[PDB]
Write a protein that binds this DNA or RNA. Structure first.
Lengths: 5, 99, 5, 100
DNA sequence: TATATATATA
DNA sequence: TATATATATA
């Protein structure tokens, strides 16, 4: 559910 | 002769989004709410189906879903990918706040 | 051990 | 600038870098051409590639004297057998050599 | 998947 | 020679 990379 | 991919997107557009180390991934352009910290220029808030992760990406990494479905929409063992293929078809508005 | 090309 | 040509003739036992299309210049050796064999194409030499122990026939335009060109072509490379080839041309240049 | 590292093209 | 693609290797 969060920022990828 | 080759039609270019778009250089602009709108909230709600369905795409394949490409990040390093990952296959092209079924995804959506979210909206950028006014009254927020401004993103970097020409980058779009992306929602990844299957994992529900987010990132900001420019149009160089974005591929309109219907035009590229036959090329990028093949099954893949990466966690969440096949779930993502299902959502972009069956529930593309999941957690969408744009409209 | 074989012929190259 | 004046430029010394590469050899137009080689002898059995000479160590070279040998160039084949699609491959980096490769540590190699001019092998024996036995009399009592089918004669080779003219001006081509039987080549032994170190590291892979492959063979082929190549003309002088694709051969580079080892010592003279070691600086340019003797750098590490990930192609299979290459670095083992660098090792062999220094440490065991006579492997499988029947010339003498 | 990505990086090296070849070749072909302009 | 500088760029863009295809193949080999990790």
């Amino acid at each position: 559910g969060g920022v990828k990379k | 002769m080759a039609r270019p991919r778009p250089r602009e997107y709108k909230a709600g557009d369905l795409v394949f989004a490409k990040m390093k180390g990952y296959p092209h991934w079924p995804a959506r352009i979210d909206e950028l709410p006014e009254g927020a910290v401004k993103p970097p220029a020409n980058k779009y808030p992306i929602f990844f189906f299957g994992t529900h992760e987010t990132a900001f990406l420019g149009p160089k990494d974005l591929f309109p879903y219907k035009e590229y479905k036959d090329k990028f929409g093949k099954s893949n063992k990466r966690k969440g990918f096949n779930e993502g293929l299902w959502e972009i078809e069956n529930n593309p508005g999941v957690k969408f706040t744009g409209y």
